[PDB]
């Protein structure tokens, strides 16, 4: 979750 | 992964 990877920001779901 | 939850910063493994 959040800023890095998973869901949120960076790598996976949500946004860059 | 990273800043939020999972492994890294915030909620789960690593650091606050």
DSSP B1-16: -EEEEEEEEEEEEEE-
DSSP chain A: -EEEEEEEEEEEEEE-
Tokens found for residue A15: 């946004």
**Spacing of C-alpha A10 from chain mean position:** 4
In our burial notation (b when 16+ CB lie closer than 10 A, e otherwise), range A1-16 reads: bbbbbbebbbeeeeee
Q: Cβ contact (<8 Å) for A3 and B5?
A: no
Could you tell me which chain A residue has the CA closest to the CA of B5?
A1
Which residues have a Cβ under 8 Å from the Cβ of A10 and sit 6 or more positions away? Answer: A3, A4, A16, B1, B2
What experiment produced this structure?
NMR
- Asked if B12 and B6 touch (Cβ cutoff 8 Å), the reply is yes
| Distance in angstroms (rounded) separating the CA atoms of residues B9 and B2 | 6
A16 vs B14: CA distance, rounded Å: 23
The reply to whether residue B3 touches residue A5, judged by beta carbons under 8 angstroms, is no
A/B interface, count of CB pairs below 8 Å: 32
């Amino acid at each position: 979750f959040g800023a890095x990877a998973x869901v949120x920001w960076x790598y996976x779901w949500x946004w860059x």
